[PDB]
Amino acid sequence: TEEQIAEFKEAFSLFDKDGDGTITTKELGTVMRSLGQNPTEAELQDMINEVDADGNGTIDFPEFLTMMARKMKDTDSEEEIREAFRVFDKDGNGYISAAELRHVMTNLGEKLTDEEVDEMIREADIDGDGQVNYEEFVQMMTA
Amino acid sequence: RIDVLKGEKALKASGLVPEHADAFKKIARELNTYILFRPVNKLATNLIKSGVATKGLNVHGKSSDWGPVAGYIPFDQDLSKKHGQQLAVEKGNLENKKSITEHEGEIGKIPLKLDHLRIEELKENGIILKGKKEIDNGKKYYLLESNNQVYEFRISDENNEVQYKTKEGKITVLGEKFNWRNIEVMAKNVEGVLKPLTADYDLFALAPSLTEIKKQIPQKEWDKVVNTPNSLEKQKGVTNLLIKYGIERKPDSTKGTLSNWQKQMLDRLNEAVKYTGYTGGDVVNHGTEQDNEEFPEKDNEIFIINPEGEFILTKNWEMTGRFIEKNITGKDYLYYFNRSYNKIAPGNKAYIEWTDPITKAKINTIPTSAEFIKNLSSIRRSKKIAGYLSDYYNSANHIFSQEKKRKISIFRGIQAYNEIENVLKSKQIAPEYKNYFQYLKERITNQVQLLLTHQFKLLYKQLNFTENETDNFEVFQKIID
Numbered sequence: 001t002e003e004q005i006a007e008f009k010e011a012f013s014l015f016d017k018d019g020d021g022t023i024t025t026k027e028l029g030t031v032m033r034s035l036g037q038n039p040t041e042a043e044l045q046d047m048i049n050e051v052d053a054d055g056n057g058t059i060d061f062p063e064f065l066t067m068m069a070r071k072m073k074d075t076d077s078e079e080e081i082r083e084a085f086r087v088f089d090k091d092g093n094g095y096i097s098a099a100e101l102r103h104v105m106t107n108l109g110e111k112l113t114d115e116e117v118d119e120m121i122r123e124a125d126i127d128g129d130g131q132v133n134y135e136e137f138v139q140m141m142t143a
Numbered sequence: 144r145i146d147v148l149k150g151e152k153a154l155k156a157s158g159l160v161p162e163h164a165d166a167f168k169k170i171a172r173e174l175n176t177y178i179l180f181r182p183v184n185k186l187a188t189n190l191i192k193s194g195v196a197t198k199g200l201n202v203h204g205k206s207s208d209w210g211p212v213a214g215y216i217p218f219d220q221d222l223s224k225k226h227g228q229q230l231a232v233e234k235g236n237l238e239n240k241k242s243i244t245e246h247e248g249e250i251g252k253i254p255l256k257l258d259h260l261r262i263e264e265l266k267e268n269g270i271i272l273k274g275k276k277e278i279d280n281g282k283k284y285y286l287l288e289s290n291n292q293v294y295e296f297r298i299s300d301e302n303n304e305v306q307y308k309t310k311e312g313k314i315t316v317l318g319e320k321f322n323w324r325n326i327e328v329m330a331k332n333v334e335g336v337l338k339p340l341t342a343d344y345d346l347f348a349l350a351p352s353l354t355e356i357k358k359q360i361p362q363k364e365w366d367k368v369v370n371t372p373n374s375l376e377k378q379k380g381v382t383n384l385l386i387k388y389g390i391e392r393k394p395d396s397t398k399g400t401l402s403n404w405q406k407q408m409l410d411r412l413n414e415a416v417k418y419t420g421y422t423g424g425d426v427v428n429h430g431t432e433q434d435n436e437e438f439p440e441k442d443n444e445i446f447i448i449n450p451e452g453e454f455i456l457t458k459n460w461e462m463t464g465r466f467i468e469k470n471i472t473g474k475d476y477l478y479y480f481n482r483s484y485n486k487i488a489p490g491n492k493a494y495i496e497w498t499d500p501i502t503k504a505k506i507n508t509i510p511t512s513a514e515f516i517k518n519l520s521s522i523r524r525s526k527k528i529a530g531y532l533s534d535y536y537n538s539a540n541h542i543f544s545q546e547k548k549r550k551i552s553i554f555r556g557i558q559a560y561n562e563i564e565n566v567l568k569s570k571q572i573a574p575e576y577k578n579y580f581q582y583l584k585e586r587i588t589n590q591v592q593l594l595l596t597h598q599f600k601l602l603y604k605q606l607n608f609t610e611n612e613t614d615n616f617e618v619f620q621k622i623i624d
C-alpha cells in the first residue's frame with residue numbers, strides 16, 4: 001500500500017548526524033526497532049549484505065524502503081490482527097481481561113484452568129495494569 | 144429492547160424470496176452462524192423466484208426499481224434506480240460498457256420483453272400500467288404508463304419488446320433527446336442463448352460461533368500451539384490460528400474478497416436455494432459487505448437470520464450496529480467490521496461510522512513508537528521520543544512482577560512526558576504538530592495517573608527535572624512510596 005510506505009520516511013530524521021540520510025549497519029535496526037518488526041543481529045547481517053554492499057554499505061531510501069518489501073510482506077498483518085483483538089474483547093472496554101481470554105479459549109476448544117488464564121494475561125501484560133491494551137496485543141503478537 | 148421488525152413483516156421487508164429465506168434458516172441454525180443480508184430490490188424478488196439469473200461481479204449495473212424495466216438492469220442506467228444523478232448514471236453506464244466489452248461472450252444485452260404475466264406483476268406493485276392502443280408503421284403498440292416525467296414507453300403486440308423515448312421538450316440527464324428505441328437489459332450467456340440478469344443477494348456480514356471456527360482448524364496443527372510447554376507465545380499461536388482459519392480474507396477472483404469459511408458458506412447457501420427448485424444458478428455470489436472497503440454502503444435495514452432461524456430487521460444503522468454489538472460481537476461469535484469504517488473510504492469518499500473498542504480506550508493508553516511515527520506520517524501536510532515509547536512497551540518485562548512493571552513503566556512514561564515538553568517549550572514550529580503533543584501529554588498523563596491509582600496527583604514538580612543516566616531512576620525509587 002501507500003501508507004505502508006509514507007510512514008517509514010519519518011524515521012529518516014531521528015538520530016543520524018549524517019545529514020542527507022545516511023546511517024549504518026551499526027544503527028540500522030535502531031530505526032526498525034523504533035518502527036515495526038524486530039529481528040535479531042543474525043537476520044540483519046545477511047539481509048543488508050545483498051542489495052547495497054560497496055565499501056561502507058551506503059544506507060538510504062531506495063534501500064530500506066525495499067528491504068521491508070519482503071519482510072513486511074507476508075506479515076502484512078496489523079489489520080489481520082487489530083481485528084483479532086476486537087474478538088477477545090467482547091466487553092468493549094478497549095482492553096483484554098483475564099475472563100475475556102478464557103471465554104474465547106474455552107470455545108476454540110481448550111478448557112483453560114482459571115490459573116493459566118491469569119498467567120497468560122500477566123505475561124502478555126507489559127505496562128502491568130492487569131489487562132492487555134491493543135498496543136500490548138500488537139507487541140505480544142510480533143516482537 | 145430495540146425497535147426491530149421480527150417475523151414475516153421482516154422477510155417481507157428484506158426483499159429476499161420467501162421460499163429461500165426459509166431454506167436459509169436451515170443453514171443459519173445448522174451452522175450456528177448469523178446470516179445478515181443487505182436489502183434486495185423488491186421488484187427483483189418474483190423475478191428471482193421466477194428463475195431470472197442474478198448479476199455477479201462482472202455486472203455492476205444497478206438494477207431498476209421503477210418503470211417497465213424495473214427489476215432488471217437497464218443498459219441505459221438512467222432507467223435504473225439512479226435515474227437522475229448524472230455522475231451516478233454516467234458511472235452506471237461505463238460499468239455496463241465494461242461488462243459488454245471486457246467480457247464479450249459471458250455478458251451481453253437483450254431487448255426487454257415483458258409478458259402478459261410480468262405486466263400484471265408490475266401492475267399490482269403499481270409500477271406501470273398498460274394503456275391505449277398506438278399504431279406506428281404497420282405494427283401495434285400499447286403505451287406503457289409510468290409516473291415518470293422524462294420518458295415514454297410501449298410494448299409490441301407482436302414480440303412483447305418494450306421501447307422508450309424522451310418526452311417532447313424534456314431532456315435526458317446527459318443532454319440526449321431521442322425517439323422510440325428499445326430498452327436494452329444486461330444479459331448473461333447460458334448455453335449459447337442470452338438470458339437476462341437481475342439483483343443478487345448481498346451478504347452484509349457472516350458471523351459464526353467461535354466454537355464453529357474450531358472445526359475449521361486441523362485437529363493437529365492446533366494441538367501443537369495448544370500443548371506448547373510455554374505459556375507466552377502459546378497465546379500467539381492460538382490467536383494466529385484464529386487469524387488464519389478465522390480471518391485473513393483473500394481474492395477469489397469472481398467471488399470477491401472473502402475467507403474460506405465464507406467461500407464454503409456461500410456454497411451451502413446456494414445449494415440450499417437450488418434444492419428449492421431455483422433454475423438459474425447461484426443466488427448469493429460475491430463475499431460479504433464487510434470486505435467491501437473501496438465502495439462501502441450504509442443501508443437503513445439489514446435482514447438477519449440468527450442461528451435460531453428467527454427473522455429480525457434492524458430499522459436503522461444506529462440499530463443494525465447496536466444489534467451486532469449486543470447479539471454478535473459480545474456473545475462469542477466471530478465478527479469483523481469493514482476496514483474502511485470510521486475512515487474516508489477511498490473509492491466513494493464514503494464516511495461510515497462504527498464503534499471501534501480500540502479507540503474508546505485510547506485517551507488512557509499511551510502510543511507505541513511506530514504508532515508515533517505513523518502519527519508523524521499522515522500529518523506531513525507541510526525526535527528521540529519514539530524511544531521512551533519503545534521503552535514503555537518493552538516486551539521484555541515478561542520477567543517482572545506487576546509491582547515492578549507498573550513502576551518502570553510509570554517512569555518510562557514520565558520519561559517521554561519530558562521530551563514531549565522540551566518541545567512545546569521550544570521554538571513554535573507548527574501549530575499543527577503542537578495540537579498533537581498536547582494530546583500525547585493528556586494521554587501520557589492519563590495512563591501514568593492510572594497506574595499510580597494503585598499507590599501521586601502532582602508528584603512531578605520535584606522528581607528528576609534535568610540530569611541524566613541511571614541515578615535518576617534512583618531518586619524515583621523513593622519519590623514513589
Ligand SMILES: Nc1ncnc2c1ncn2[C@@H]1O[C@@H]2COP(=O)(O)O[C@H]2[C@H]1O
Binds near residue numbers: 203398400431432435
Ligand atoms: N470482496 C467483496 N465483498 C463484498 N462486496 C464486495 C467485494 N468487492 C467488491 N464488493 C462490492 O460492493 C458492490 C455491491 O454491488 P455489487 O454487488 O453489484 O457490486 C459490488 C462491488 O462493487
Ligand SMILES: [Ca+2]
Binds near residue numbers: 126127132
Ligand atoms: Ca497492560
Ligand SMILES: [Yb+3]
Binds near residue numbers: 199343344345
Ligand atoms: Yb448484486
Ligand SMILES: [Yb+3]
Binds near residue numbers: 343345346429
Ligand atoms: Yb453484492
Ligand SMILES: [Yb+3]
Binds near residue numbers: 199344345
Ligand atoms: Yb452483489
